[PDB]
C-alpha cells in the first residue's frame, strides 16, 4: 500500500552513487495512544547501507 | 553466466610518470559510481567525496563507501583503465599492494576503509586530466574496528579542547601508528557521537545490580590480568548504586534489555562491506574471497 | 599611451576587481552560478594563452 511505504532516497538533488541493490526494510514501532499501548508498522526503501538507515529512521520517528 | 568488466575511457594520453604508479598497484580495490562497461574517470576516484581544498570527513567518506559498487583493476593501458567488478556473491582473486603493510593468512577476514594513515601515499594525482584518484584501504576487522574506535575517541577530545599521543595513535600488537588528522570536518563524525549519547545513557539506566556487586567483590583483592583498567581502586560511583538488596527476577528483566540494546550497537559501529578470505597465498600476495554487502 | 590605465580599480595588482573576481571555481552540491567578469580577472587561466 502506498500509505504504509515511506521512501528514503528523495532529493532535489540540491550527487549520490548508483548501484545494483536497493533494499526494502520493515519497521515496527511500539507507542501509546489514548493511554493505551498500540503499534505502528511502516516500510522503508533505500540502498544506503545499514549504518545510515538506522540514523535515517530515527530522524523520521523523532516526534 | 554473468559478465563483469569495466573499461574506462579517457580523454588524454597518460604520461610515463603516472603510468609507473598505476602499474605498481595493478591489483587494487577502488569504488566507482555507476554499474556499466564504459565510464568516465571522474567516477573511479574516491576523491569525489575526499578532495584537497574541501576538508574531508572520514566518517562521511566511510559512510559513502558502503553505497558504492567496488572494483578491482586488471590492466593499465596508456589510454584506458581496465577494471573488473565485485558483486554479491562471487569468489574472486584479491591481491594486496596496500602500503601500510599487514600480513594475512588462510581463513582471515577483511573490510574496506578510507585512507587514514597517509593520504599523500595513498592518493596519486593525475595532472594530465586534472582529476585525482583516491585509493581506499583494506584492513582486517580487528584493526578495521580499532581505527574507528580511535577516530571516535578523537572527535570527543578535540571538542573538549575548545595532547596527541593518546588521541591520534592506533595501538596494535607490535606496532603503533598515526592517524591522519590535520583538517577534518567533525560534523558528520558527531551525529554518530550524538547517537552514542543516546544509547550509552540508556545503558546506564538499566545496569544490573548483581554485576556491580560482582566488581566490588572482585577488583579490591582478586586481581586479574584484564581488570588492570581500574588500577586496584573502586570507582566512587559503583559504591553508590549497590545499596539496594539483590533480587534475581529484577535483573532478569534488566539483562534482557541489556542484551537487546547491544544488538543495536552493530548499527553505529558498522564497517563497510566485508570480505571473507578462505584461501590466501603468502609469496604471491594473492587471495580468494567472496564479497558480502551488509 | 597618453595614459597607463583607465580605471585603477581593476588593473592595479590588489584592486577591488582582483579581490572579488580572481577566485577559481569552487564546486558545491548546491548549483554554482556564473560570473562574466571572471574571464578578465584571472591570472591562472590567462597564462594558458
Quick check: A19 and B67 CB within 8 A?
Answer: yes
Structure-determination technique: cryo-EM
Q: Of B68, B191, B294, which is closest to A19 when you measure between CB atoms? A: B68
Reduced to 3 states (helix: H, G, I; strand: E, B; else coil), residue C44 is helix
How close is the nearest chain B Cα to the Cα of A62, in Å? 13
- Is C2 in CB contact (< 8 Å) with chain A? no
**What HEC string does chain B produce?**
CCCCCEEECCCCCCCHHHHHHHHHCCCCEEEECCCCCEECHHHCCCCCCCCCCCCCCHHHHHHHHCCCEEEEEEEECCCCEEEEEECCCCEECCECCCCCCCCCCCCCEEEEECCCCCHHHHEECCCCCCCCEECCEEECHHHHHHHHHHHHHHHHHHHCCCCCCCCCEEECCCCEEECCCCCCCCCCCCHHHHHHHHHHHHHCCCCCHHHHHHHHHHCCCCCCCCCCCCCCCCCCCHHHHCCCCCCHHHHHHHHHHHHHHCCHHHCCCCCCCEEEEEEECCCCCEEEEEEECC
Phi-psi region of B130 (alpha: psi -120 to 50; beta: other; left: phi over 0): left
Q: Does residue B167 contact residue B157 with C-beta atoms inside 8 Å? A: yes
Rounded Cα–Cα distance for residues A36 and A53 (Å): 29
Q: Give dist(CA B151, CA B180) in Å, integer.
A: 10
Cell of B16: 610515463
Q: Which three cell numbers stand for residue C29?
A: 552540491
Closest CA to B51 of B224, B205, B60: B60
- A–C CB contacts, 8 A cutoff, strictly below: 4
**Do the beta carbons of residue B109 and residue B289 sit within 8 Å?**
no
Tell me, in Å, the resolution of the deposited structure: 3.8
Among C27, C28, C29, C32, the strongest candidate for a mutation testing the A interface, having the largest count of A CBs within 10 A, is C29
Helices B191-203 and B141-159 cross at an angle (nearest 10°) of 90
Amino acid at each position: 500500500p502506498c500509505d504504509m511505504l515511506v521512501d528514503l532516497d528523495e532529493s532535489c538533488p540540491m550527487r549520490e552513487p548508483a548501484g545494483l541493490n536497493v533494499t526494502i526494510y520493515a519497521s515496527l514501532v511500539y507507542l501509546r495512544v489514548n493511554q493505551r499501548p498500540s503499534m505502528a508498522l511502516t516500510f522503508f526503501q533505500s540502498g544506503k547501507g545499514f549504518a545510515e538507515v538506522v540514523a535515517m529512521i530515527k530522524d523520521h520517528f523523532t516526534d | 553466466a554473468l559478465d563483469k568488466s569495466i573499461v574506462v575511457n579517457l580523454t588524454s594520453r597518460l604520461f610515463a610518470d603516472e603510468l609507473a604508479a598505476l602499474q605498481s598497484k595493478i591489483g587494487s580495490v577502488l569504488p566507482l559510481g555507476d554499474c556499466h562497461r564504459l565510464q568516465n574517470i571522474q567516477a573511479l576516484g574516491l576523491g569525489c567525496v575526499c578532495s584537497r581544498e574541501t576538508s574531508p570527513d572520514y566518517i562521511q567518506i566511510m559512510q559513502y563507501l558502503s553505497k558504492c559498487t567496488l572494483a578491482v583493476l586488471e590492466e593499465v593501458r596508456p589510454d584506458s583503465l581496465r577494471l573488473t567488478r565485485m558483486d554479491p556473491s562471487d569468489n574472486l582473486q584479491i591481491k594486496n599492494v596496500y602500503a601500510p603493510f599487514f600480513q594475512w593468512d588462510s581463513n582471515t577476514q577483511l573490510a574496506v576503509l578510507p585512507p587514514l594513515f597517509s593520504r599523500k601515499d595513498s592518493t596519486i594525482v593525475l595532472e594530465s586530466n586534472g582529476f585525482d584518484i583516491v585509493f581506499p584501504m583494506v584492513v582486517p576487522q580487528q584493526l578495521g574496528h580499532a581505527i574507528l574506535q580511535q577516530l571516535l575517541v578523537y572527535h570527543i577530545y578535540s571538542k573538549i579542547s575548545a595532547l596527541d599521543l593518546y588521541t591520534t595513535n592506533v595501538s596494535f600488537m607490535g606496532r603503533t601508528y598515526r592517524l591522519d588528522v590535520d583538517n577534518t570536518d567533525p560534523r558528520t563524525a558527531l551525529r554518530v557521537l550524538d547517537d552514542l549519547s543516546m544509547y550509552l545513557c540508556i545503558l546506564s539506566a538499566l545496569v544490573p545490580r548483581g554485576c556491580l556487586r560482582l566488581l566490588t567483590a572482585l577488583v579490591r583483592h582478586d586481581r586479574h590480568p584484564l581488570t588492570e583498567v581500574f588500577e586496584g581502586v573502586v570507582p566512587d560511583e559503583v559504591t553508590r548504586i549497590d545499596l539496594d538488596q539483590l533480587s534475581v527476577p529484577d535483573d532478569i528483566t534488566r539483562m534482557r534489555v541489556m542484551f537487546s540494546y547491544l544488538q543495536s550497537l552493530s548499527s553505529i559501529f558498522n564497517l563497510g562491506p566485508r570480505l571473507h578470505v578462505y584461501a590466501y597465498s603468502a609469496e604471491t600476495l594473492a587471495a580468494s574471497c567472496w564479497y558480502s554487502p551488509r | 599611451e597618453c595614459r597607463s590605465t583607465n580605471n585603477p580599480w581593476a588593473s592595479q595588482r590588489g584592486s577591488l576587481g582582483d579581490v572579488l573576481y580572481n577566485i577559481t571555481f569552487r564546486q558545491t552540491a548546491l548549483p554554482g552560478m556564473y560570473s562574466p567578469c571572471r574571464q578578465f580577472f584571472h591570472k591562472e587561466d590567462i597564462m594558458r594563452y
